[PDB]
């Protein structure tokens, strides 16, 4: 199965 779309963008890595 295809991975589901996100609800919202993940945040970038902190450092």
């Amino acid at each position: 199965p295809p991975p589901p779309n996100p609800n919202d963008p993940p945040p970038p890595n902190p450092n």
Partner: antibody, heavy 111, light 113 residues
Framework: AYLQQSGAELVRSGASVKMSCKAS????????MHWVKQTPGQGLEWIGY????????NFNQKFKGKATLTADTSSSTAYMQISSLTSEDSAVYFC?????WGQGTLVTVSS | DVVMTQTPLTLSVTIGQPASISCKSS???????????LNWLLQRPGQSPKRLIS???ELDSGVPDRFTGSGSGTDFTLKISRVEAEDLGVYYC?????????FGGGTKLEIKR
């Protein structure tokens, strides 16, 4: 394709409550894990999320001082703690991530 | 905060009838990566919510093709071509573009029989 939340809880005013959300059937670290409060009149209110991939959290400013969000990548389990519970904190709390929602955890603040 | 306004508050429909739900945001939901993070949920009575559509128009696995999502910018629509019995409950939109994340007020769909 599934989020399983922990059981209902009775908690005293001023104490804290911790609930869990165990994930399966999708890459746990690839999606923001959201927590949502459902009010008695069908309203849905976002508390915040944690991205289990790097631990970054973002909060609704209303819950910032009392909700703590964590994630255990080894067990694919997210957690929310809510401290200093008051009467208005009695609600059903959902976790949501990717295409899935948990069944909800019913919290009752009562002495 | 970005406000999500859903209309109507209640849909009373018969089996086979088309249905339409409007969701308007107070600001654009276009994000800087070019995507628009608008999601649609159904919470059937006595059930946990279930996501039907994400990214405005993309149906989740298992969702029947009688559901369609459309719109852009601030104005979004979920349409049911022919309502079936199991489509009842409360529909919510919610946006993943702005902080805080925010939900529509909900649309109750009920069946006339």
């Amino acid at each position: 394709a599934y989020l399983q939340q922990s059981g209902a809880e009775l908690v005293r005013s001023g104490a804290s409550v911790k609930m869990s959300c165990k994930a399966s059937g999708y890459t746990f670290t690839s999606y923001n894990m959201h927590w949502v409060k459902q009010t008695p009149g069908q309203g849905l209110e976002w508390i915040g999320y944690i991205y289990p991939g790097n631990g970054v959290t973002n909060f609704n400013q209303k819950f910032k001082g009392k909700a703590t969000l964590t994630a255990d990548t080894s067990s694919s389990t997210a957690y929310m703690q809510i401290s200093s519970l008051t009467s208005e904190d009695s609600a059903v709390y959902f976790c949501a991530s990717a295409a899935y929602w948990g069944q909800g955890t019913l919290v009752t603040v009562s002495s | 905060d970005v406000v999500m306004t859903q209309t109507p508050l209640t849909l009373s429909v018969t089996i086979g009838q088309p249905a339409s739900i409007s969701c308007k945001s107070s600001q654009s939901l276009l994000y800087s990566d070019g995507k628009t993070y608008l999601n649609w949920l159904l919470q059937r009575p006595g059930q946990s919510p279930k996501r039907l559509i994400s990214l405005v128009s993309e149906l989740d696995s298992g969702v029947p093709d009688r559901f369609t999502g459309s719109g852009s910018g601030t104005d979004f629509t979920l349409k049911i071509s022919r309502v079936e019995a199991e489509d009842l409950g409360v529909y919510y939109c919610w946006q993943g573009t702005h902080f805080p994340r925010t939900f529509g007020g909900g649309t109750k769909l009920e069946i006339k029989r």
